[PDB]
Amino acid sequence: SVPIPGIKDISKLKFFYGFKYLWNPTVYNKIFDKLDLTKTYKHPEELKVLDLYPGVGIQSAIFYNKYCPRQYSLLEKRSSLYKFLNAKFEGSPLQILKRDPYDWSTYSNLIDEERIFVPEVQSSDHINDKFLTVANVTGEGSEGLIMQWLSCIGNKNWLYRFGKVKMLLWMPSTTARKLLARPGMHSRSKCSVVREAFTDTKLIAISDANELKGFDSQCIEEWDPILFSAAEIWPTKGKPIALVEMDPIDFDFDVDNWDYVTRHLMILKRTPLNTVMDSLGHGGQQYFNSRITDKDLLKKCPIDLTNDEFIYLTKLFMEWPFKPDILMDFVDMYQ
Amino acid sequence: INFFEIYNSLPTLEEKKAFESALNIFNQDRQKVLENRATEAARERWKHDFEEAKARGDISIEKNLNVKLWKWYNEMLPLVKEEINHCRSLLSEKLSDKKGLNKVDTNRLGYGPYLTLIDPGKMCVITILELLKLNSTGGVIEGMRTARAVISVGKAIEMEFRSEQVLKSESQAKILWPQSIRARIGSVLISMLIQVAKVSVQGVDPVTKAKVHGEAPAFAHGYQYHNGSKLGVLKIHKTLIRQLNGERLIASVQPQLLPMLVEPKPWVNWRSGGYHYTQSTLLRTKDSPEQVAYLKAASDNGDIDRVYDGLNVLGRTPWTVNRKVFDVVSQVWNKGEGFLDIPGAQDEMVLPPAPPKNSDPSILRAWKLQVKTIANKFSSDRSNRCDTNYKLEIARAFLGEKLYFPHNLDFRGRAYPLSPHFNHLGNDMSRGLLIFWHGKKLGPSGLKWLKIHLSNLFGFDKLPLKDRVAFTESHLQDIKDSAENPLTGDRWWTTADKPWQALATCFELNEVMKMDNPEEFISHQPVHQDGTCNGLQHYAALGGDVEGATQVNLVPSDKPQDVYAHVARLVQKRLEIAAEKGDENAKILKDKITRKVVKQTVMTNVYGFSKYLTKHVFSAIRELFHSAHLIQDWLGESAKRISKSIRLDVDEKSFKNGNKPDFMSSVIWTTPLGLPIVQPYREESKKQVETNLQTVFISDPFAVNPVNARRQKAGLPPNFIHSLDASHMLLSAAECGKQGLDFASVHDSYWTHASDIDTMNVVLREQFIKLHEVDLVLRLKEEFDQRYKNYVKIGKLKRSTDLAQKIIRIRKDLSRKLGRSTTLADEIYFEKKRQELLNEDITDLDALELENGNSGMSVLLPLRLPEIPPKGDFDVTVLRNSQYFFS
DNA sequence: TATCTACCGACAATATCAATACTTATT
DNA sequence: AATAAGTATTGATATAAGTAATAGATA
């Protein structure tokens, strides 16, 4: 029974680097009822949780008191936040570690070298039921971290080498709107195509009622996200935050060529395919016109393309005898 | 034939003068051919190649690219003249109405009048050439940036039109197109070139592995994300890259500015001089309008006559390619292995095996970085090899004849040769290739100077002249081996600091050694004489420093003293004490520190895991030259004050914010020779102008721009020192040219014959005196006080007050009648201009009295430059005897 | 006093999209 | 004489994805 920190304690913490942490226990009860984690984690008494950016550490205490896992590793580096977490959760079955979530080495050292946190590798058909990852990447500047972690799902090399590890990610509402955009919407970019190809992702809770107007109406009906006020986020200044449950899925395309094609097509996400295929290589439009026998697809802008059409285009790209080199796509600045 | 051999053959000087006189006449026609415009030369050459090849047959030989270019031109010309016709079909409509909202409304009506100004074939040749020149630039791997390309093509068309206009005006006896029109015109032309340029390419399909061929566009317009911000690029097909990075590139893209074969036209005004037919300006930099405006005014006054004298002596020196060195470099080039600086021919880049995709992100990131490094090195070597081949082609063409390099000035005033590709101011190989056309008997002094020259080249210039001569004598057998067998032997010359020049001098010395009487031998080899860090010598002279002057050899000494070594010793002691203190940064890096690192940091300072080195080197140099540090502080402070000053007349209600005036004043000063210098550090404001291919993020140079105060302050000291260096060089060049010396200056070094060095040395010292007998910091402060007289500065209220005449100056309250006091009227008028709290008139005048009795407010001080630092006593005229002043 | 926090300049370019000013088309 | 409409133009934001770089006074 880890003692949960309240609003009294977490008000003395002056620095947060820009991160916002929900502190209301009732909203956490609603969220953990909505997730019903005991449906995918049948034996919670053996689950291993890796908490990145725990911050105030209320979600962690509530998770432990509700499910009582086997090992709960809190990777908190921030000085004042580490001080609070280690002064409040001393002697408790939580594991507070002072290691930077951002650094890649942190995982390699912890999982492999120090062996403090050792997950269980599982197959790639079901969600890993012995390893669950939780993260609060809420800082307005720490958006590249989410994208890198999504790329890791495609590469199966960071933590997704232990199977299909489910992630519970707090993130700005603008980030969740970028990711959860559906074909043709306004916020549809390559991050959303990456999410669509690699993940099955639901919006579990949002911190503003006037933010849900940026998501898909049908998707908002299916998800039914919990709504709570900004009076329960502690740092009461910044933008709204959004909780996102993210389960990896299977994919059978070439991630390198798909990355190239998707990144170069979503530049001109409003130009029809009649004229946007020359940005891929020399003679790209002639080739993709002689090849695409669906003369209707040739009219859809890359913002209207689903992921399956993107995989189709990368399949055509990899059959192109004169395709460019996807390695020499950088800008040589030493020049 | 080899004209140089015939010239050397002639026994008597009168006969040589007669032959040279004949040579000028015979070379006039060839010079006219050399100055042929790019459009005419390129079109004639590739068309001729295509016509000849058609008869010979089709093959992928040296002229294959020329044939492709002529085909592209022929099938692109109809497109552009059809565009012109379609522009005229609506340009005579005279009715601007609700028309096609994109293709004719604003775009075609805008550039319509600009396509007609020049014939279409010229535009086709210009776009083809200007895209070929931009291969592998701007960071793109095998292409260019689209903004640079569209602007280069539009600007080349503008320059061709204005050249045509100048020629028409001389024969019969917008103005400057905006950036938007340049961009739009260039994009329109390159679009057509993109859509007619085809190249045949091979490839092996993955589904069937059948070797298949097909046509593909030679250029493509795409984008690339760099650091998360897309830029549009134009990629060139690899089939074309093989021929752009090829030995025959010079045939396709010839160099318009080559060394002339006839004496350059003397500079008589800023716009006339140099090339006989090509017309060139007196300033290399055309980006800044203000610099050209001041240069034009100064030229009109005629006060830069001394600058012309120096430039004309610098330009009238005849050179000739060093055939002996040329053969060795040509042999090494043909061999293909990597030599001292030559990279060595490489077919394709070899990348290390890719790591498994499942490897953790750090491993992948490292691999990506390594791939970037390998690609950068490969592109670097290809660029270097191409530049070398181009330079050797120019050298081979001019091997027999005598060539002259006309010179130009930069904003600071440094002189640069007009011909960029091949000149004596380039790399070590380029310097080695060139030698003086005129041969002067060595004499007693010359032999010693040639030996000391070789010693200097090998890097032993610290030692006294006797030691340097001793070194050459001791290595006489090595010199013989290097000259007799340049490559098959031990290659001792390769170990030299400047190997190509060392080889050239080795050849010269070897010839001398075979002569019973060395003095009779006539040497064409130029000998380089330079002072150790010219800037420090100037700082010492301006300051009057005594401790500093000794280090720079201002005061005569038996043993030459080098600043670099003394500062290195001091900073070494400083690091030693730092290490004793307890920091490990000094200890780990003590061994690594060498003379070169100090030479580079000191050179940058005076001319522009460890951070201890930069601070310590600056601290040591500051202590060594305290007066110089004081002058640098004064220059920086003056630049900052000028940057914050606001001109009274230019201030009006035009400002976007009434209380936030823009700062448009840039430091401007006059060189002792009279050349005006205008620091061009403005704040660019870029915008997306719409073109056919894309919207390019370009900046307008005509747009007046607030001055970049930070760069102004960081640039006064180095630019002032560069101006003094250029002044000393132009004075000594004028004097040497008057005395009859062939003077060549490579900014740091002054070159002449070995038999003239002594002579030149005298001149050098003398001109230094003639430059520093007058207090230059004081003259600069007086010029600043005159030019920045009626300016006003914005000031905060966090520091103390300096004087007691501001409180009445800002008000302009006192009656000013019966005298022209419209300045009082003008200063008050500016306050009217400044937008104080007013609907009425006297509300900011009576407020400052509470500030005059202060209260925090952005006050209007008068611009007052500080007083010059105390000048340490040092008679510069003791320099007439320092035999190591320049050495 | 000895690590904690702050200085975003290379978002050193460009596509797209919402908001702000400059012509109008009937009664 | 209305009253909505349009467009021409400008300013904002997102883009990719190891986060370059320094200190700064303070906990």
Keywords for this structure?
heterodimer; A: 335 residues; alpha/beta; Rossmann fold; Helicase, Ruva Protein, domain 3; 15% strand; globular; B: 887 residues; mainly alpha; Helix Hairpins; three-stranded antiparallel beta sheet; 32 helices; 51% helix; 11% strand; DNA-binding
Give a brief outline of the structure:
Chain A is an alpha/beta fold and 335 residues long.
CATH superfamily of the largest domain in chain A: Vaccinia Virus protein VP39
Rg of chain B is: 31 Å
In quaternary terms, these chains amount to heterodimer
Strand order of the largest sheet of chain A: 3-2-1-4-5-8-6-7
Give me the side-by-side strand order of the main sheet of chain B: 1-5-4
Strand content of chain B: 5-15%
CATH topology of the largest domain in chain A: Rossmann fold
Calculate the terminal CA-CA distance of chain B, rounded to whole Å: 38 Å
Which range does the strand content of chain A fall in?
Answer: 15-25%
Shape of chain B: globular
- According to CATH, what is the class of the largest domain in chain A? Alpha Beta
Largest protein-protein interface = A-B, 35 and 46 residues
Main structural class of chain B: mainly alpha
Number of strands of chain B: 24
Radius of gyration of chain A: 22 Å
Q: Quickly count the domains of chain A.
A: 2
Helix content of chain B: 40-55%
Principal-axes geometry of chain A comes out as globular
Structural class of chain A: alpha/beta
Enumerate how many helices of chain B there are, as a single number: 32
Pfam families (chain A): RrnaAD
Keywords (chain A): DNA-binding, Methyltransferase, Mitochondrion, RNA-binding, S-adenosyl-L-methionine, Transcription, Transcription regulation, Transferase
Binding site for S-adenosyl-L-methionine (chain A): 22, 76, 100, 136
Function (chain A): Mitochondrial transcription factor that confers selective promoter recognition on the core subunit of the yeast mitochondrial RNA polymerase. Interacts with DNA in a non-specific manner.
